[PDB]
């Protein structure tokens, strides 16, 4: 089997991407944030505290003839941005782009933090990291990809995120028309539950490539590119007037600037992020200070290849017995 679904930016900055997902019988379609940095499929629901729902579409298990309470199971998750959610668990039929999993754990939110309430465009998350990170207790549950894997033509999914435009998540096949050149594959460590890999270095603009190993994660659920402070300083030093602002929370730059590109290494191959992809616009409406798309990881504990980096590539998440990641230009 295979599946193919379009993913669409939630706003004009590509802050996140939503993909329609069918849950239950008859189908209830919710727009979920596919997140290769976490491993829970959770949704706004008929059980979510009413004051914490503000425009989202909700899953109502009592209207699904295939829903069943997973008795005794609870979940609770906290994300790197400080947001969180928790609740109980149903199993139900879940389909993405024509690919159907029966018995998928659908985590129903009883509580969500303010950032989720305040984002009316995201109805939940669909985690695509390794199932060892799933938070359901006392019986840990499998991700959608883990459940579908055996039925897939090939044990892979691909992320093809657009710059200010829709893109595609495919399951079970590699669309050879969606990229240019060849795909370069690189080793993955699953020891922390993430799609963790080592980039071979970087370049700023037209500058020379610096060979240096940068361990980090491929995370579709993080907006920006978070790298070591040395790398990020070298980037922003090429932008007149750019500076790190403690009050704003990162590097800012004059909105009048033209930003240089940023290149990262995948083995001997190179992925170029155009300068425009690094512009996240005014820090507040009408400001002439703009927020940068490359930020320091120093306060995180891990480097994160988020959407800024991934949307410059066609990315293969290879879930074979020994997982690997593939990157191609497009």
Which of 143, 158, 219, 177 minimizes the C-alpha distance to 3?
A: 158
CATH 2.40.70.10 correct for 5-174:
yes
Whether 190 contacts 320, CB under 8 Å: no
C-alpha pair distances (Å), 39 with each of 17, 112, 135, 165, 204: 17, 17, 8, 26, 33
Q: Which CATH superfamily is domain 175-330 in?
A: Acid Proteases (2.40.70.10)
Which of 40, 33, 39 minimizes the C-alpha distance to 159?
A: 33
Handedness of CA 123, 82, 50, 87 (dihedral sign): positive
Give the DSSP letter string of 3-24: EEEEEEESSTT---EEEEEEET
C-alpha pair distances (Å), 137 with each of 79, 198, 208: 18, 32, 50
Distance CA 30, CA 110 (A): 17
Q: What are phi and psi of 272, to 5 degrees?
A: -105, 120
Instruction: Mention every residue, 6+ apart, whose C-beta is less than 8 A from residue 55.
Output: 120
Q: Which helix (H) or strand (E) holds 70?
A: strand 68-78
Which of 275, 277, 289, 284 minimizes the C-alpha distance to 241?
A: 289
Give Cα 259 distance to the centre of its chain.
24
CA end-to-end distance (rounded Å), the chain: 25
Angle at 290 between CA 16 and CA 244, to 5 degrees: 100
Residues forming the active site: 35, 199
Whether 227 contacts 216, CB under 8 Å: yes
Radius of gyration of the chain (CA): 20
Return the structure tokens found at 11: 């706003």
- Solving technique for this entry? X-ray
Distance CA 124, CA 21 (A): 10
Q: Which residue has the tokens 């080793």?
A: 187
With H, G, I as helix, E, B as strand and everything else as coil, classify residue 186: strand
Distance CA 152, CA 323 (A): 15
Whether 134 contacts 146, CB under 8 Å: no
| Greatest pairwise CA separation for the chain in angstroms | 60
Return the structure tokens found at 78: 């906290």
Strand partners, 271: 264
Which of 21, 223, 273, 25 minimizes the C-alpha distance to 125?
A: 21
User: Which bin fits 164, alpha (ψ -120 to 50), beta or left (φ > 0)?
Assistant: left
For residues 280, 227, 127 and 187, what is the CA-based torsion angle, rounded to 10 degrees? Answer: 140
Give Cα 122 distance to the centre of its chain.
13
Strand partners, 67: none
Which of 104, 96, 323, 82 minimizes the C-alpha distance to 218?
A: 323
Q: What does the domain layout of the chain look like in residue ranges?
A: 5-174, 175-330
Whether 46 contacts 61, CB under 8 Å: yes
Give the DSSP letter string of 72-124: EEEEEEE-TTS-EEEEEEEEEEEEETTEEEEEEEEEEEEEE-HHHHT-TT--E
Q: Where are the alpha helices (DSSP H) in the chain?
A: 114-117, 144-148, 229-236, 307-310
Distance CA 274, CA 83 (A): 30
Q: What is the DSSP letter of 296?
A: E
């Amino acid at each position: 089997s295979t599946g193919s679904a379009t993913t669409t930016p939630i706003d004009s900055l590509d802050d996140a991407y939503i993909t329609p997902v069918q849950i239950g019988t008859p189908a209830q379609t919710l727009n979920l944030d596919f997140d290769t940095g976490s491993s829970d499929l959770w949704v706004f629901s008929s059980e979510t505290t009413a004051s914490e729902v503000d425009g989202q579409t909700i899953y109502t298990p009592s209207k699904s003839t295939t829903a069943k309470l997973l008795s005794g199971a609870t979940w609770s998750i906290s994300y790197g941005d400080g947001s969180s959610s928790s609740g109980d668990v149903y199993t139900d039929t879940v389909s993405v782009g024509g690919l159907t999993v029966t018995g998928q754990a659908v985590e129903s939110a009883k509580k969500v933090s303010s950032s989720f309430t305040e984002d009316s465009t995201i109805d939940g998350l669909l985690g695509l990291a390794f199932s060892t990170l799933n938070t359901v207790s006392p019986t840990q549950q499998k991700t959608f990809f883990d459940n579908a894997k055996a039925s897939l033509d090939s044990p892979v999914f691909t992320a093809d995120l657009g710059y200010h435009a829709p893109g595609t998540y495919n399951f079970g096949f590699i669309d050879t028309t969606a990229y240019t050149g060849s795909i370069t594959y690189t080793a993955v460590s699953t020891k922390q539950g993430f799609w963790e890999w080592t980039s071979t270095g970087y370049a700023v603009g037209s500058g020379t490539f610096k060979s240096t190993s940068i361990d980090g994660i491929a995370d579709t659920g993080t907006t920006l590119l978070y790298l070591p402070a040395t790398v990020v300083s070298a980037y922003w030093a090429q932008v007149s007037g750019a500076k790190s602002s403690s009050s704003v929370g990162g590097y800012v730059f004059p909105c009048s600037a033209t930003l240089p590109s940023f290149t990262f290494g995948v083995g001997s191959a190179r992925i170029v992020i155009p300068g425009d992809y690094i512009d996240f616009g005014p820090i507040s409406t009408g400001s002439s200070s703009c927020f940068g798309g490359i930020q320091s990881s120093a306060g995180i504990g891990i480097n994160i290849f988020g959407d800024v980096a991934l949307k410059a590539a066609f990315v293969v998440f290879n879930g074979a017995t020994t997982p690997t990641l593939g990157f191609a230009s497009k």
